[PDB]
Amino acid sequence: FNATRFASVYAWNRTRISNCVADYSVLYNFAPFFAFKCYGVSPTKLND
Amino acid sequence: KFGAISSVLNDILSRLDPPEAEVQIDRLITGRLQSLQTYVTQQLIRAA
Ligand SMILES: *[C@@H]1O[C@H](CO)[C@@H](O)[C@H](O)[C@H]1NC(C)=O
Numbered sequence A: 001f002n003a004t005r006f007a008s009v010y011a012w013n014r015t016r017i018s019n020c021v022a023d024y025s026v027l028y029n030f031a032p033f034f035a036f037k038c039y040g041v042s043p044t045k046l047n048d
Numbered sequence B: 001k002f003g004a005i006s007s008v009l010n011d012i013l014s015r016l017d018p019p020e021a022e023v024q025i026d027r028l029i030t031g032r033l034q035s036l037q038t039y040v041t042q043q044l045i046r047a048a
Helices: A025-029 B011-013 B018-047
Strands: none
Touching: B011 B018
């Protein structure tokens, strides 16, 4: 989320997230969210 | 699944917002009840 050169849509960067503990509060406070349309899961209960 | 996102109620209750969860819940109910009705009808015929 703190990158500087997010690649263009024609060649979208892909990263793998594994072997860690996820707390999306950093994801919340590191962006003035404009659209958070989650489909397969409710954003509220995301930490369990 | 009968056309829902998943066949486990505990899974589909913690992966969707309550206002939308009812849509996926109200498919398992109907599938299960049609299965039950089919069972009871064949049982009545066998009993006869
Ligand atoms: C990391 O985030 C901080 C806080 O927004 C920002 O000041 C800093 O420039 C960021 N670093 C990079 C390399 O983007």
